[PDB]
């Protein structure tokens, strides 16, 4: 009654609140170029008035789907974003020039230029989910029969992004946080993921993308290098105990709706990132005042990881809304398999919620079935609940809110905020990103090889649009 409206309310105040954080015309970032996605608006305290190649990689994703599915007045703002990237490529940084090391950057001026001062750099997931974007789009213009626009506009684009994910997916590098120097589960899932998706388009475009070929199935087999016994290692060189929503994240960015519960993948419905949910949720349970007094059974306000220290370490909107995400995601992959199974692996996570679970497969039509789907939505809903209690009243989304009173705190109407809103929101209606291959790319090697491939870089300039409708 009040969930469901508070959501179709939010997911509109999301996509304004978008578009005012995107240049050249975006209300709330005079300065931005054309294309640019800020962070947020936010100058002074923190200050996030800067682009992340991870940020607008997100966020694009996500304007992509909406456009797809309908949103047709989006398409300029795609445009903007890809012919501002045509320029970002080529700009030379701290991480490098185009083909040494740029392309890692993770953070420029909303001008355009570099930022040139000290930084946890470089981000090797910028440009694998920038590539994602891209290829979304790409995907799109072929179908519709713009085939020149896909071909020698995205094609060399994406061409530059993957040839740096084959080159370098096997380096250390900072986590999606920018703390960590090391080696994280988030940044090789989406570059798997990324490095399948590009091979695809490529060979769509009449071209082909040998590295993409060799790479993939080594970062699948290094992957699976993050499964503990009990739940995914969010990093390797870390002394935190590893239980991060960095590994929620990474589940639902490459999530594939017609992918099985896949654990080589680590699928929203896979036995391992069942049992991941469990714990990463549960390690935010007894440290948030704002959680005291919720049964195991009851949703809970998520941080990021459990020893954040981060303005003291609160409860974040996307992670929370991470959380559902995932359950939004595996309810729909049960209903299209018609069972849902229950492992050795998943019964705690199963268990907490339907005290009745025992291992085994349940049907569709199974009684079991409706008892766990039910309790599963609920759950999912509860997550959700929290966020729009927390939320302003006008329906802005900060970064943070308070691990006591809830208040809002941290960057004000971040762009990253409200792009989690509309998948969360998208997944619960059962509306579903297009597939990125997963089902021809879930088979692990035998032995796994440190290693890389070199690809090719190439500077592309966008001369012109052809006059594409919608
Ligand atoms: C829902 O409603 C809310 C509530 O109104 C809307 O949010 C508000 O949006 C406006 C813009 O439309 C923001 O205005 C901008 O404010 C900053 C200053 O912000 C700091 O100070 C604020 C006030 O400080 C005093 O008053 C408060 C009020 O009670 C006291 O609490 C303080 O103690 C002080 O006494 C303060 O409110 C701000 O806090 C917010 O942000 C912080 C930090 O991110 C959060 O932690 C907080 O929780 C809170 O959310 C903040 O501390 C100005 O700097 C901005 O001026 C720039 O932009 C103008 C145009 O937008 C321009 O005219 C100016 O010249 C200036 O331009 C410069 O900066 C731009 C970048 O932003 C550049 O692009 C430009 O080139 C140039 O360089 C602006 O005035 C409000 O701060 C914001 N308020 C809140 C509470 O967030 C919200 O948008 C609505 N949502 C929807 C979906 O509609
Ligand atoms: C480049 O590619 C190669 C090839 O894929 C990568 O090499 C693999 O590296 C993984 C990760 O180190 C490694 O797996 C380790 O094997 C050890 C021996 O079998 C294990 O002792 C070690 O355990 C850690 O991870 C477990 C989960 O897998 C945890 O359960 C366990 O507690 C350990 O975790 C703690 O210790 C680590 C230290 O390794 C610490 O950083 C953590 O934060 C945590 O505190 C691993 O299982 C494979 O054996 C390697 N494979 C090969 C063929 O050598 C290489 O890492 C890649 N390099 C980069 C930078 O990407
Ligand atoms: C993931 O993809 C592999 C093929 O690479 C399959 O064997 C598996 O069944 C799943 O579809
Ligand atoms: C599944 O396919 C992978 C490649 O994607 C192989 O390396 C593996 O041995 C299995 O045949
Ligand atoms: C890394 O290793 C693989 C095989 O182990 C090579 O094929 C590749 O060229 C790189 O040297
Ligand atoms: C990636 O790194 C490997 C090293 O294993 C090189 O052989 C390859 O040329 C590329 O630089
Ligand atoms: C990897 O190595 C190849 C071979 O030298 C280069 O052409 C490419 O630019 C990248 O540096
Ligand atoms: C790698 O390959 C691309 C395209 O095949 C070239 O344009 C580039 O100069 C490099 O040789
Ligand atoms: C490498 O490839 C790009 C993309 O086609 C060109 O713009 C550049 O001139 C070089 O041939
Ligand atoms: C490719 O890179 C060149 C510089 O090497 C740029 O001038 C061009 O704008 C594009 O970014
Ligand atoms: C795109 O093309 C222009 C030439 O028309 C180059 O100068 C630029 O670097 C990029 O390759
Ligand atoms: C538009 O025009 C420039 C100059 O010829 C090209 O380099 C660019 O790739 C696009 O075709």
């Given at each position: 009654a009040t969930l469901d409206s508070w959501l179709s309310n939010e997911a509109t105040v999301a996509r304004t609140a978008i578009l005012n954080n995107i240049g050249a015309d975006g209300a709330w970032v005079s300065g931005a170029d054309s294309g640019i996605v800020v962070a947020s608006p936010s100058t002074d305290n923190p200050d996030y008035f800067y682009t992340w190649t991870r940020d607008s990689g997100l966020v694009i994703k996500t304007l992509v789907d909406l456009f797809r599915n309908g949103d047709t007045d989006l398409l300029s703002t795609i445009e903007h974003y890809i012919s501002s990237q045509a320029i970002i490529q080529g700009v030379s940084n701290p991480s490098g020039d185009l083909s040494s090391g740029g392309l890692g950057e993770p953070k420029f001026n909303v001008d355009e230029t570099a930022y040139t001062g000290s930084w946890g750099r470089p981000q090797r997931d910028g440009p694998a989910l920038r590539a994602t974007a891209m290829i979304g789009f790409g995907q799109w213009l072929l179908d519709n029969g713009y085939t020149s626009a896909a071909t020698e506009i995205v094609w060399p684009l994406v061409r530059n992004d993957l040839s740096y994910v084959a080159q370098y997916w096997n380096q250390t590098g900072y986590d999606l946080w920018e703390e960590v120097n090391g080696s994280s589960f988030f940044t090789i899932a989406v570059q798997h993921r990324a490095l399948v998706e590009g091979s695809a388009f490529a060979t769509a475009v009449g071209s082909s993308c040998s590295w993409c070929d060799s790479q993939?199935?080594?970062?699948?087999?290094?992957?699976?290098?993050?499964?503990?016994?009990?739940?995914?290692?969010?990093?390797?060189?870390?002394?935190?105990?590893?239980?991060?929503?960095?590994?929620?994240?990474?589940?639902?960015?490459?999530?594939?709706?017609?992918?099985?519960?896949?654990?080589?993948?680590?699928?929203?419905?896979?036995?391992?990132?069942?049992?991941?949910?469990?714990?990463?949720?549960?390690?935010?349970?007894?440290?948030?005042?704002?959680?005291d007094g919720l049964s195991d059974s009851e949703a809970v306000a998520v941080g990021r990881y459990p020893e954040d220290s981060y303005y003291n370490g609160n409860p974040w909107f996307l992670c929370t809304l991470a959380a559902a995400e995932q359950l939004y995601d595996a309810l729909y992959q049960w209903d299209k398999q018609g069972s849902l199974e229950i492992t050795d692996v998943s019964l705690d996570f199963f268990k907490a919620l339907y005290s009745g679970a025992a291992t085994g497969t349940y049907?569709?039509?199974?009684?079991?079935?409706?008892?766990?789907?039910?309790?599963?939505?609920?759950?999912?809903?509860?997550?959700?609940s929290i966020v729009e209690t927390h939320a302003a009243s006008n329906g802005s989304l900060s970064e943070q809110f308070d691990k006591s009173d809830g208040d809002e705190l941290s960057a004000r109407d971040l762009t990253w905020s409200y792009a989690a809103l509309l998948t969360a929101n998208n997944r619960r209606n059962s509306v579903v990103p297009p597939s990125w291959g997963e089902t021809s790319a879930s088979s692990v090697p035998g032995t796994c090889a440190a290693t890389s491939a070199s690809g090719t870089y190439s500077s592309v300039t966008v001369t012109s649009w052809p006059s594409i409708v919608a």
């Amino acid at each position: 009654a009040t969930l469901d409206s508070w959501l179709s309310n939010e997911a509109t105040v999301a996509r304004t609140a978008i578009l005012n954080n995107i240049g050249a015309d975006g209300a709330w970032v005079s300065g931005a170029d054309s294309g640019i996605v800020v962070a947020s608006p936010s100058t002074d305290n923190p200050d996030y008035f800067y682009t992340w190649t991870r940020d607008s990689g997100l966020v694009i994703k996500t304007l992509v789907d909406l456009f797809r599915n309908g949103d047709t007045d989006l398409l300029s703002t795609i445009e903007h974003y890809i012919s501002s990237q045509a320029i970002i490529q080529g700009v030379s940084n701290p991480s490098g020039d185009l083909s040494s090391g740029g392309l890692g950057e993770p953070k420029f001026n909303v001008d355009e230029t570099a930022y040139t001062g000290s930084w946890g750099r470089p981000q090797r997931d910028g440009p694998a989910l920038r590539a994602t974007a891209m290829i979304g789009f790409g995907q799109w213009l072929l179908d519709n029969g713009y085939t020149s626009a896909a071909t020698e506009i995205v094609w060399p684009l994406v061409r530059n992004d993957l040839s740096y994910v084959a080159q370098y997916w096997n380096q250390t590098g900072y986590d999606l946080w920018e703390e960590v120097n090391g080696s994280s589960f988030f940044t090789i899932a989406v570059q798997h993921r990324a490095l399948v998706e590009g091979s695809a388009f490529a060979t769509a475009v009449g071209s082909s993308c040998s590295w993409c070929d060799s790479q993939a199935p080594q970062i699948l087999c290094y992957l699976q290098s993050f499964w503990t016994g009990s739940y995914i290692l969010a990093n390797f060189d870390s002394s935190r105990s590893g239980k991060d929503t960095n590994t929620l994240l990474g589940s639902i960015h490459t999530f594939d709706p017609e992918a099985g519960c896949d654990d080589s993948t680590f699928q929203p419905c896979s036995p391992r990132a069942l049992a991941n949910h469990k714990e990463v949720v549960d390690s935010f349970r007894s440290i948030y005042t704002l959680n005291d007094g919720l049964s195991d059974s009851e949703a809970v306000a998520v941080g990021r990881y459990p020893e954040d220290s981060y303005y003291n370490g609160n409860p974040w909107f996307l992670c929370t809304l991470a959380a559902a995400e995932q359950l939004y995601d595996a309810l729909y992959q049960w209903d299209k398999q018609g069972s849902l199974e229950i492992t050795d692996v998943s019964l705690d996570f199963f268990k907490a919620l339907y005290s009745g679970a025992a291992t085994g497969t349940y049907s569709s039509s199974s009684s079991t079935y409706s008892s766990i789907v039910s309790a599963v939505k609920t759950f999912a809903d509860g997550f959700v609940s929290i966020v729009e209690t927390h939320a302003a009243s006008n329906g802005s989304l900060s970064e943070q809110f308070d691990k006591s009173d809830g208040d809002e705190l941290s960057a004000r109407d971040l762009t990253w905020s409200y792009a989690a809103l509309l998948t969360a929101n998208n997944r619960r209606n059962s509306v579903v990103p297009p597939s990125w291959g997963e089902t021809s790319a879930s088979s692990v090697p035998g032995t796994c090889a440190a290693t890389s491939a070199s690809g090719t870089y190439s500077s592309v300039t966008v001369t012109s649009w052809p006059s594409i409708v919608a």
